[PDB]
Amino acid sequence: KNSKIFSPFRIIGNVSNGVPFATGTLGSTFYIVTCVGKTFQIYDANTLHLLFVSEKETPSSIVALSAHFHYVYAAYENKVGIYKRGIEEHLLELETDANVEHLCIFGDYLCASTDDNSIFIYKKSDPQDKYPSEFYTKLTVTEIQGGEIVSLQHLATYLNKLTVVTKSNVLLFNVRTGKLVFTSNEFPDQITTAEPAPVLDIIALGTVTGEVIMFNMRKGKRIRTIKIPQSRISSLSFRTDGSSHLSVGTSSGDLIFYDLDRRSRIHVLKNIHRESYGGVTQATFLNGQPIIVTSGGDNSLKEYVFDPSLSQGSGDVVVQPPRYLRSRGGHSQPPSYIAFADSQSHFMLSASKDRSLWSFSLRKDAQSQEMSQRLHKKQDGGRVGGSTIKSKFPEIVALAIENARIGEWENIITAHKDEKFARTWDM
């Protein structure tokens, strides 16, 4: 179905489609690889400029994403792609009929997980080789060990050990042996998220109910337990900057910053992502930085920061609340109508079904500005017949724009759905 005139290039105005992103670094440059359906992008995190984008589409949507140093590991319908700067360079077809559900990488061992509880371990062809290509082995977890595979992690300082967190317990698999070396005890609550703490041998498990279990593998024991009820825990992160703060992102779209030393709730952020689209699908501290990147499923990606404390002596007791820092976003729904703002092809207006007009840049995606809806005061200065609370206009069914006199009066006219008047907009 390929053409002789056109060719797909990229996608404007998308930051995430709900699949949890992955952070990584190249020395000073911190990057964030985020999926958009069949095509991922790689953002910077120092300034959130776009850095790379996958030039070739995947035939289906990407299911899993990971990224160590200079390689991005995508997992769509059956295969794993090892890509470099968005250029696909190694495909890896699994020898099954299932779909790849989880993925991790450590040392010379890629570890994928297909939904019928089937783990695949891949070895690099050389210790100095860059990506695992050779198929090492395949393991399976039947139902006597645990439930469905929820997550794969690799704890630090574990020679060829892989931590498999299922819905019921926590297993340790040695891939050099291909053997389950240690199964943990049973938890009455189904586990949803896992996170390797920067402390040794300890993983945090967020369950379906409000339980954050700090569990140690060496003792095989629940060291600590934090109770948040009426909440499904959806993301966990640890401040590695030099303080003991935990970030719990619950699927009602909330963030809670806990202090583990004083056993306190430092702060809570309400509705940083839309609850209807899953809420906070990932919250992640930057490694060694007081900056948390929070992505939702509503095509929104924010970055918050922690200021230094104002108290000279106390500090960690008098900790500052999280300041909002930079962000990108898009539409919740698909856009309804689009137009080009000028002959230079720099900006594009797009109105969607979510009752919102947005002007996107084209060059580098740093300028995805929502167009405000803040009414101008009338020249008469009289009263307007309207309610007490603001609410966005209905969806835009037609649009027209000119640039012959921009910045001297209005130059966009938008016709809304089921509305007996069209609005003007200043560009």
Binding site: L310, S311, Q312, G313, S314, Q320
Partner: protein, 423 residues
């Protein structure tokens, strides 16, 4: 960062080091008692002699200062310097100075304490190195020339910007600006940590506690509109109340009662939170005046809360704790008091709890009902649970006597309840 900001940082790091005669005359002229000229012209041995006399006076007052005579008030304490010492010794100095300010927070009307603190200021530079502990210490004396002098000579950390307005004027700081200081949120966390240190060292007093509670009540009154601000101000004040109840002194318990009462009548809390507050109060209740104010507090809290499950019965543990720490004759004479505060929902829940659990003191129940003027839905609830208790328990003469009392007062309600449930 901008180079001006980085040089400001290095100035704040080398703040207390005198690198010329002018900066030395500044750091030495800043004094607590003497003015600028004589403060500049006098000397360390003069100051230390006055310090030793003032502190032996203070040890005569109370024997706690002898350790500071041993370690902070010696001739080697003349000889040393802050900056030439290492980081560990700096931290140890700050710990000793915080202990001393915590101790001398309570005698600020005494010229001996003023003289000892003058020595500490002009030798160890507390008014430059650690101003937060000193200001949290002497905040409650905000209408005193000592506090005005501290405000004139101090360098202000960024939280005390209202006092930064009030520097070098001639009027004391106002109650309104004290309210603004405590109305800032992070300053409340600062003062929370300070009160926690004060509690864990068990050195609190009536004037400090009174100023604390008056500021807190005025703060929640100033925030009596913003429900988001009230909700995010719940954990601070309620945690201060929790640890102030964990303390043992009757002053701390009455201050916690006051904060709890005003908070629960300014913002409608949850039933579980009010039951938890009642549980901690009943657990740590010890003394007579604390008992009196605590009974008034439970009255106020149950009079505030209102919802589905308003007058339901107390749980087993809370009810047993209440009848342990309180007697029927005491609650009876409290009802017999002349003021008669509105114990409607509280007496209703207490009566239903007694009727479920004990089923013995029904004459005491009758005395409560005859003493208090009840309310219609509460009497309806009482009659329904009494119907259930009559049908479960064996029939009692005092039980049918309570029924006859209802015949005296509104038999028709008993008829409506019995026709909804029974004959």
């Amino acid at each position: 960062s901008s180079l001006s900001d980085q040089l400001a940082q290095v100035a704040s790091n080398n703040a207390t080091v005198a690198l010329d005669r002018k900066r030395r005359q500044k750091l030495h002229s800043a004094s607590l008692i003497y003015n600028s000229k004589t403060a500049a012209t006098q000397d360390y041995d003069f100051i230390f002699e006055n310090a030793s006399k003032a502190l032996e006076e203070l040890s005569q007052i109370e024997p706690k200062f002898a350790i500071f005579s041993r370690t902070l008030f010696s001739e080697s304490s003349i000889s040393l310097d802050r900056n030439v010492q290492t980081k560990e010794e700096i931290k140890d100095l700050d710990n000793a100075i915080n202990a001393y300010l915590l101790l001398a927070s309570s005698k600020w009307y005494l010229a001996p304490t003023l003289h000892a603190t003058e020595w500490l200021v002009r030798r160890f530079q507390i008014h430059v190195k650690n101003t937060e502990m000193l200001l949290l210490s002497t905040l409650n004396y905000y209408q005193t020339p000592v506090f005005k002098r501290i405000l004139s000579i101090i360098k202000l950390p960024p939280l005390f910007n209202c006092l930064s307005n009030f520097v070098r004027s001639e009027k004391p700081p106002t109650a309104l600006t004290m309210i603004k200081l405590f109305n800032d949120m992070d300053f409340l966390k600062l003062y929370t940590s300070y009160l926690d240190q004060c509690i864990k060292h068990n050195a609190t007093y009536t004037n400090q506690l009174l100023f604390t509670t008056c500021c807190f009540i005025n703060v929640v009154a100033f925030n009596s509109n913003n429900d988001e601000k009230l909700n995010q101000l719940v954990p601070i004040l309620l945690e201060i109340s929790a640890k102030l109840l964990a303390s043992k002194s009757k002053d701390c318990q009455i201050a916690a009662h006051t904060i709890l009462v005003v908070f629960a009548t300014a913002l409608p809390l949850k039933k579980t939170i009010i039951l938890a507050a009642m549980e901690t109060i009943l657990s740590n209740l010890d003394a007579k005046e604390a008992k009196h104010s605590a009974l008034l507090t439970i009255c106020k809290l149950f009079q505030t809360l209102k919802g589905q499950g308003n007058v339901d019965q107390l749980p087993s543990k809370i009810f047993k704790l209440f009848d342990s720490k309180f007697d029927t004759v005491s609650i009876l004479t409290f009802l017999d008091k002349e003021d008669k505060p509105v114990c409607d929902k509280f007496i209703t829940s207490y009566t239903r709890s007694i009727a479920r659990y004990d089923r013995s003191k029904l004459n005491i129940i009758l005395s409560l009902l005859k003493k208090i003027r009840l309310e219609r839905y509460e009497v309806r609830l009482i009659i329904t649970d009494l119907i259930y208790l009559s049908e479960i328990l064996e029939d009692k003469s005092q039980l049918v006597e309570l029924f006859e009392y209802f015949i005296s007062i509104n038999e028709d309600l008993v008829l409506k309840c019995l026709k909804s449930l029974g004959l």
